[PDB]
Amino acid sequence: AVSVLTMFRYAGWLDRLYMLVGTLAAIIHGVALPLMMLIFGDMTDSFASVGQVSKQSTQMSEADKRAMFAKLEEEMTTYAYYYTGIGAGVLIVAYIQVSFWALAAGRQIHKIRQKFFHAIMNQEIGWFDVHDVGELNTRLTDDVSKINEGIGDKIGMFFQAMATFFGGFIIGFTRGWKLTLVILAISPVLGLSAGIWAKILSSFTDKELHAYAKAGAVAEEVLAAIRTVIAFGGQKKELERYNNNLEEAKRLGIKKAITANISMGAAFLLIYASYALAFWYGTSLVISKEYSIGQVLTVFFSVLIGAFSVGQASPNIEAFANARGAAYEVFKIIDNKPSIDSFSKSGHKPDNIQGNLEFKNIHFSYPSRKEVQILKGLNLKVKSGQTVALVGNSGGGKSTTVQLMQRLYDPLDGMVSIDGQDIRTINVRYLREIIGVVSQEPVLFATTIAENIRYGREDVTMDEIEKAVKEANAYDFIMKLPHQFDTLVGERGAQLSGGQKQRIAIARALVRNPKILLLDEATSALDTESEAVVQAALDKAREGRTTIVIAHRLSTVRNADVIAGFDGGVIVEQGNHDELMREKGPPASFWRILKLNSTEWPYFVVGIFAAIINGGLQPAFSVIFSKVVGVFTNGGPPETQRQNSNLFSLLFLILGIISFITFFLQGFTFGKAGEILTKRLRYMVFKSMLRQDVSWFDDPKNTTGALTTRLANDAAQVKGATGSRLAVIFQNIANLGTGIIISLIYGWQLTLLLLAIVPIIAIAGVVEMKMLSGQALKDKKELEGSGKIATEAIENFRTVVSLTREQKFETMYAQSLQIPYRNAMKKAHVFGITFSFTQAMMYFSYAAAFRFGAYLVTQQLMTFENVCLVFSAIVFGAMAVGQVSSFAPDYAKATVSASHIIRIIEKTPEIDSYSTQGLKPNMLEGNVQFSGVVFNYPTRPSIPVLQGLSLEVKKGQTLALVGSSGGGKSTVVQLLERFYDPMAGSVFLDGKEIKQLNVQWLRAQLGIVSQEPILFDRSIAENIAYGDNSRVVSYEEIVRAAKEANIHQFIDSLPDKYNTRVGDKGTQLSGGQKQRIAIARALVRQPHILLLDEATSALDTESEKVVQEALDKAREGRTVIVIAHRLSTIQNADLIVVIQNGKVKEHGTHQQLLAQK
Ligand SMILES: C[C@@H]1NC(=O)c2csc(n2)[C@H](CS)NC(=O)c2csc(n2)[C@H](C)NC(=O)c2csc1n2
């Protein structure tokens, strides 16, 4: 499903030369760095030769060694010269490698995007039909961006890394006859351990995902019908399943975190064991006497650099593989032969045609389906100078005759002749330009009408084309109405009426001045005043040239002299219209409250201290590392060098073991702490959402899926925002600080030199990342114009086809893409120069460090063991800082954002709810009054619904309120349970207001029933028992409830009876009975008042007979307010008190017939 070796089809010879020089530049750099490393080994060998104790007399002999110290200084100067030469080479090669590879891509992308646009806009409409409009643009944008990035930088970097690893292993050929054997034999152990630990971690991650899946599902189902939840107030009764699922998820996550931490610790342990074994073997080899320690050190460093190179090569090859599929796809759009070309050489065209089309054997339909036939063959012919009208259900499905006229589609065996000759011989562009169309929707360009008229056809003169706009509504519509100055109209402001749009479309058609005109729904569903005027323009266009018309209303049929229309493919004559029947017509977190949220500092605190000792591993490492060189620096060869080397190897191994156990304890504490925090946050936040009022969920910004994702993925962000980060802070700062202090104790000059130079490279890297990001964002912003052109063109693709003026679109797209293309070349050189500059700064820092170290050694003030000590300590500490900060769990980024979102939603103060302050009366005489209360949706106060309503209810009355809009009326019911809060009026229940009430107690005494009976993923009984939340639990009273609701037969029919469970809609219950079980749930609460809006969800109308039976039984049992926009429901209601918007009272049907039907 991908392609390779052929994605560079459009590459030019200069482009291939650019690539050839670039890749060569990469091998050069990749070879150069291990050359630096080998010269470091020769550097350590020179120091070893100088620091030979030899005879005890020699120490103070030769003028205290002053002469050969001068020789050493000369050698050091030569080595520094070679160092800076290599640095300049690294800078010279880097500029060319990054710039050329990117430059070539810049040109490659410039060619490929233009070719893609040309092909896609040259494609036939049927291809677009089986596709969409937005996803074409999205595919274009993301695929070209990926290809650009990949073939711009990633391939060059990959060749660089591959060459680095190679050159390291060319050194490794010899230096590794003994060393590579052992080092590259212990490396596969590291690889296998990493692989098995990654597999175990992935298995644990999948297990915890499947464990949390149940919690996610229950969250989704409770949030979907949360209105029912707040109607029953089951939040307290809720969350136990959520709590248990989170408990299981937390327990599995503890194991997951333990596994990840032990995997990482094993990684450290294998690294350190490899170090120890390699140095043990190297010390033995150098002690053999035929070898120098510098060669061991340089081969070991070179193979480490090769490992670094292999590790760095992975993202680049991944990006290349990702871009391969996008390249294959984008090329697959290319090279597809369309049905028509419009640019073919075979374009013979007759001159001054009369348009006497003849039609025969028209068998064609939508190409998307080959089962339904729309055109069944029409033996129709037309004549010049006579307007023809088509009448029927539509234009043969949907104006498909028009699609036939200009070759939008390709009829099968459909023979159509414009004047007696086949359309195949005629040029596509000529055929399109000699034919004019009228769109059913006059949608236009987001720009001034002048260029729209220019788009219509070649403007001979602006005044001439303006004269052509002499159709009815001329001048007042073109100038008096659009700001008088010709103005950009379109989606971006300057809206005009549909009459203006149709009129300008007619004007464009007249500018085309075709021999044959096409009219498709000129005033389809337009204003009655908008029509009856543009039809005059249509008529005055029709006397000029022959045309076909399809009319929205039969009036044009009267206007048309010839009426040849039908439906179903049965051709009818056009002699007269008499046969035609009488058709009717958010700030960041303080980071301290977040930490304080973890009130579990004991199981926390040790980890910090544990982390601290971990920070001591890195510099202490270098210490023993330096001492290894200290073995073979100035000292006595035979007394203890073997024993000293063995002792320091044992120190390496015990250091690795203590690091392993340290990181084990670190994991065992931070994982547990983070897991307990994850559980605590989820437990609190879920209660927070169930606590929030209905309005909070109504806001369209937050949706059920959005809140579920908030519960799902806004925890791992905290896992790393709270406990792992402080561990990173403490370990990193302890490492760097102890390295600096040991440097200061063991060094006085070069220590500060390194401490000063490393920050400038760090800030250079940071600023060049910042500049790359800024340039990328600037480019994405300034391609917005080209994106706008592409979107506007593709959205109006049918209009583009209907209008021959199409190459102009390619022209503006090319210009608005080449300006960013020029910006791309300008960015390429800058990117290359900065990357080369930072590499040169790194190499220069290295060279200066070595020069100063050697110079101060010539002063005889710090021994090589100390110079190498401080240098390796600081550099490896900085490397550890970098690796740990990247191995760190994404602190900030999307984590602190989700953290403050979690804090906001938890601390959200909603309208008072679940508040115990609400007064609760012992008994309710159902004294509900609804007089003088006005309110609407808080999210959209645009419509002040519920205006001037007066209503009052006593015990036993059946209030059959029936407003014209059921959904609008639903709000009146929604107010009784305070889903929304009234402000204009007050509602009094039992003679006292409802706002000063125990929300739950009010809800408790309210048997609401929703029109849509959504129930949970629980059993038939577990759902009916949900009504008695915070109440007496129903034990076998459910039998009485079902008997009262008369659904006993269906509960009895179920195999497990009450136990039968509605599991993920398995054994799905009948549509006409879910409302019944909801009614049973409502009557379980046994309230003094019930609310019903059942209406009729489905069309079964049989269980519907049973549902009003249950409703009348309930209403004779207890007082009820029933809402139903159904004639049968209101007629069945004995107490007909139908009132709409407060206009009438009591029985409307007796007062007036308006209520009836
Ligand atoms: C897994 C990841 N490492 C690599 O991807 C990697 C590729 S090559 C390489 N390491 C070389 C030879 S394997 N290593 C050293 O030169 C070295 C000297 S000290 C030191 N590492 C300290 C102990 N390491 C970390 O703190 C640490 C945290 S994460 C991490 N390393």
Q: Which two tokens stand for residue 770?
A: 């910042």
Give one DSSP letter per residue of 449-498, joined into a string.
HHHHHHHHS--S-HHHHHHH--STTTTIIIIITTTSS--B-SSSS----H
Atom of ligand 1 nearest to the CA of 311: 7
Distance of alpha carbon 732 from alpha carbon 373, whole angstroms: 73
Say if CB 713 and CB 678 are below 8 A apart: no
- Residues 220, 708 contacting (CB under 8 angstroms): yes
Q: Which residue type does 126 have?
A: G
CA distance 843 to 85: 10
For the chain, the distance separating the N- and C-terminal CA atoms, rounded to the nearest angstrom, is: 61
Which one, of 166, 150, 146, lies nearest residue 26 by Cα? 166
In order of their start, the domains of the chain are: 358-563 (3.40.50.300), 928-1151 (3.40.50.300)
- Atom 25 (ligand 1) nearest CA: 880
933 neighbors 984 (Cβ within 8 angstroms): yes
Nearest C-alpha to atom 11 of ligand 1 is from which residue? Answer: 304
607 CA to centre of ligand 1 in angstroms: 21
Distance CA 1044, CA 1156 (A): 32
* Phi/psi at 565 (5° precision): -150, 160
Atom of ligand 1 nearest to the CA of 621: 19
Task: Looking at the CA of residue 272, tell me the nearest atom of ligand 1.
Answer: 23
Task: Confirm if 409 and 489 have CB atoms less than 8 A apart.
Answer: no
The method recorded for this entry reads cryo-EM
* b/e per residue 920-940 (b: at least 16 CB within 10 A): eeeebebebbbeebebbeeee
Resolution of the structure in the document, Å? 4.3
Q: What distance in Å separates the CA atoms of residue 781 and residue 1115, rounded to the nearest whole number? A: 64
Distance 946 CA to ligand 1 centre (A): 70
Q: Please, are residues 735 and 880 in contact by the beta-carbon 8 Å criterion?
A: yes
How many angstroms is it from 659 CA to the middle of ligand 1?
13
The amino acid sitting at 588 is: A
Q: Is 623 within 8 Å of 742 (Cβ atoms)?
A: yes
Of 228, 375, 10, the residue nearest 1018 (C-alpha): 228
CB-CB contact of 433 with 455 (8 Å) = no
Q: Token match 């706002």: residue?
A: 995
Residue 786 CA: distances (Å) to CA of 75, 783, 791:
60, 5, 9
Query: Of all protein residues, whose CA lies closest to atom 7 belonging to ligand 1?
Result: 308
Residues in Cβ contact with 831 at an 8 Å cutoff, skipping those fewer than 6 apart: 98, 99, 102, 772, 775
In whole angstroms, give the CA distance from residue 406 to residue 423. 9
User: Which ranges of 692-806 does DSSP label H, i.e. alpha helix?
Assistant: 694-698, 704-713, 716-746, 750-782, 784-795, 797-802
Q: How close is the Cα of 269 to the center of ligand 1, in Å?
A: 11
In sign, the C-alpha dihedral spanning 830, 835, 836, 837 is positive
Expressed in angstroms and rounded, the spacing between residue 304 Cα and the centre of ligand 1 is 10
Taking the CA of residue 267 as reference, the ligand 1 atom at the shortest distance is 1
Q: Whose CA is nearest to atom 10 of ligand 1?
A: 308
- Nearest alpha-carbon partner for 653 in 609, 617, 629: 617
Pocket test for ligand 1, best of 659, 666, 876, 883 (most atoms within 8 A of CB): 883
Query: What's the rounded Cα separation, in Å, for the pair 521 and 548?
Result: 11
Q: Which residues pair with 1092 in a beta bridge?
A: 1009, 1122
Rounded CA separation 918/996 (Å): 6
- Token pair of 1115 as six digits: 């209403």
The rounded radius of gyration (Å) of the Cα atoms in the chain is: 41
Query: How far, in Å, from the CA of 91 to the mean position of ligand 1?
Result: 27
Nearest residue (CA) to ligand 1, atom 24: 880
Atom of ligand 1 nearest to the CA of 887: 29
Residue ranges in 1101-1146 assigned as alpha helix (H)? 1103-1117, 1127-1132
What is the per-residue burial (b if ≥16 Cβ within 10 Å, else e) of 419-435? eeeebeebbbbbbbbbb
> What separation in Å is there between the alpha carbon of 268 and the centre of ligand 1?
7
Report how far ligand 1's centroid is from the alpha carbon of 561 (Å): 89
Cβ-Cβ contacts under 8 Å for 928 (sequence gap 6 or more): 952, 953, 976, 987, 988, 989, 1089, 1121
Closest C-alpha to 408, from 367, 371, 461, 374: 367
SS3 702: coil
The closest-lying atom of ligand 1 relative to the alpha carbon of residue 617 is 23
Q: Rounded to an integer, what distance in angstroms lies between the CA atom of residue 307 and that of residue 1041? A: 73
Distance CA 393, CA 397 (A): 7
Count of CB atoms situated within 10 Å of the CB of 709: 12
Which amino acid residue places its CA nearest to atom 26 of ligand 1? 880
Protein residue with least CA distance to atom 20, ligand 1: 880
Q: From the CA of 871, how far away is ligand 1's center (Å)?
A: 17
**DSSP secondary-structure letter at 990?**
T
552 alpha carbon to ligand 1 midpoint, in Å?
76
| Closest protein CA for atom 13 of ligand 1 | 271
* 876 Cα: distance to centroid of ligand 1 (angstroms): 9
Instruction: Quote the ligand 1 centre to 202 CA distance (angstroms).
Output: 22
The 3-state DSSP composition of the chain as helix, strand, coil percent (nearest 5) reads 60, 5, 35
Q: Whose CA is nearest to atom 2 of ligand 1?
A: 883
To test ligand 1's pocket by mutation, which of 271, 626, 652 has the most ligand atoms within 8 angstroms of CB?
271
**CA-to-CA distance for 514 and 361, rounded, in angstroms?**
26
In this structure, the dihedral spanned by the alpha carbons of residues 261, 265, 267 and 269, taken in order and rounded to 10 degrees, is -170
What is the spatial distance between Cα 1141 and Cα 949, in angstroms, rounded to a whole number? 6
- DSSP single-letter state for residue 516: E
HEC string for 31-61: HHHHHHHHHHHHHHHHHHHHCCCCCHHHHHH
Minimal-distance CA residue to ligand 1 atom 16: 304
* Ligand 1 atom showing the smallest separation from residue 190 Cα: 13
Q: How many CB atoms lie within 10 A of CB 165?
A: 23
Helical (H) or strand (E) element with 417: strand 415-417
Query: What is the CA(981)–ligand 1 centre distance, in A?
Result: 61
Cα 301 to middle of ligand 1, angstroms: 13
Backbone phi and psi for residue 289, each to the nearest 5 degrees, phi listed first: 95, -15
Tell me the two tokens of residue 345.
Answer: 């050489």
**Considering only CA atoms, which of 1087, 1058, 1055, 1067 is closest in space to residue 989?**
1087
Atom nearest to 880 CA in ligand 1? 26
Distance CA 947, CA 969 (A): 11
| Element at 1002 (helix H, strand E) | helix 999-1004
Ligand 1 cavity residues, CB under 6 Å? 267-268, 271, 304, 307-308, 311, 618, 621, 876, 880, 883-884, 887
Question: Of 659, 819, 124, which Cα lies nearest the Cα of 408?
Answer: 124
Q: Residue 345 C-alpha to ligand 1 middle, in angstroms?
A: 65
Residue identified by tokens 């050069």 is 28
With CA atoms as reference, report the closest residue to 165 among 25, 20, 33.
33
Contact 790, 799 (CB under 8 A): no
